[PDB]
């Protein structure tokens, strides 16, 4: 399967760590973003909103990286652990993927990319999103071990994917209890981990 | 199942047309956002991200509009019609529910919140973000009538939800013919089409 990817970017990261948990080797090709590769017809035929990640399963095109996850899962998983059959543990598992993307992430890329990209001033009023996005998290972890549940799921790697981001961001976590137990069980028992905190380190360099 | 909504909202509206196409009648609970209802120590521990749309389903508290709509077709449909089983064809109609949550919808907020809900002036090249977000989706629709395949999915109720929005904020529709088309059957075919509309009218007071 082709990966469509750069190593610092948190969705490419989140589906480059499913792939580990599951015992898969993409076959890796980075885009040059930069240099408008994913602008030009053959990658548009491909993924006509020109974004990574993008996965290429034999003719089957697909991208939104916390798709492209719960894909691996549903179709190459041996289990269903990683993103289980049961509707209300799904459901959990769904809304904290939508979480991940619309509130914790979209404070990330809403605060720094302005900076790191645009070279704009920081704004204190959208740090405040961040903190709020913290929060949230930290009260959806209060009794459980995992993001969504008590073992390890798609929303734990998607959202540790935004969280190690976050941490080479210079982000305190230390100030969500919560949120920094859950972050320190899962690098060492998230699959990929090592591969996504190298990718996070070549992200760093943009700060 | 407890539902706590406003009909004018976007994300309540899919919620609805979904529980219609699945034949089931919701307890529908409006909740007063001004107020500050949401924000009460009641509602936190039912949702404590203070968001609706908010299902209820016995002691099981769900939110994130796209996650309770998939979670009603999991549980509740006789069969997977609304949002099929095969890996492929889930994949593509999570795509589009990401789609409409992150690059649609979102376009659609930020566009014309701050002009209805704070009186700021309308920033064109916010506007040209809408014109993007149409163009991928006119794209989607090539050679297949519904958004992401051949049969209405939770995918079309997500994106109608949007786009009926934007006609009511009088958007032009029209310099997007398959999207255009894609809508005109919707009105047709979609269950709770008119519960839909009769909501977008209630928006468009905002207006
Ligand atoms: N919500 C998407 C976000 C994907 C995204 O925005 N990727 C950026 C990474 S820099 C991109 O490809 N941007 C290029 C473009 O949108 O043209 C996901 O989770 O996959
Ligand atoms: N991505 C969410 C969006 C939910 C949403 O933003 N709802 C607004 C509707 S006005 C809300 O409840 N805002 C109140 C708040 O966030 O405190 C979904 O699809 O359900």
Redesign the interface.
Known sequence: MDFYYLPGSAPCRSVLMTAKALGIELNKKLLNLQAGEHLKPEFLKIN??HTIPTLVDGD?A???S???M??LV??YGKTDSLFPKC??K???I??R???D???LY?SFADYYYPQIFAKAPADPELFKKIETAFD?LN??LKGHEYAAGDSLTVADLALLASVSTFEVASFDISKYPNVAKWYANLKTVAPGWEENWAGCLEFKKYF
């Open positions: 006509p909103q089957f697909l991208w939104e916390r798709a492209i719960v894909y549903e179709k509707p209300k799904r459901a959990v769904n809304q993927l939508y979480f993307m619309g509130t979209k949230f009260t959806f």
